[PDB]
């Protein structure tokens, strides 16, 4: 249980580091690309539509990564608390186990 808990946290951390690296890069792309639009023929409403599409895209990026974290925690919890008579209806989670 010690070695597996470690590996599981390392793998779970690798997803956290990957998420933080992508959201920062996407945010930088927003700053740089939004600066071009604000410095060149800028208008109030259009820039808001570009940043809204930027915020919405960033939201989806964090949601996806959080889904994997939720899936990972669902996998580690099921193994530690596992016992006979337990029923697994996911079938993809069972394949992962």
Curated annotation (Swiss-Prot):
Belongs to the RNA polymerase beta' chain family. The RNAP catalytic core consists of 2 alpha, 1 beta, 1 beta' and 1 omega subunit. When a sigma factor is associated with the core the holoenzyme is formed, which can initiate transcription. DNA-dependent RNA polymerase catalyzes the transcription of DNA into RNA using the four ribonucleoside triphosphates as substrates. This is DNA-directed RNA polymerase subunit beta'. It comes from Mycolicibacterium smegmatis (strain ATCC 700084 / mc(2)155) (Mycobacterium smegmatis). The gene is rpoC.
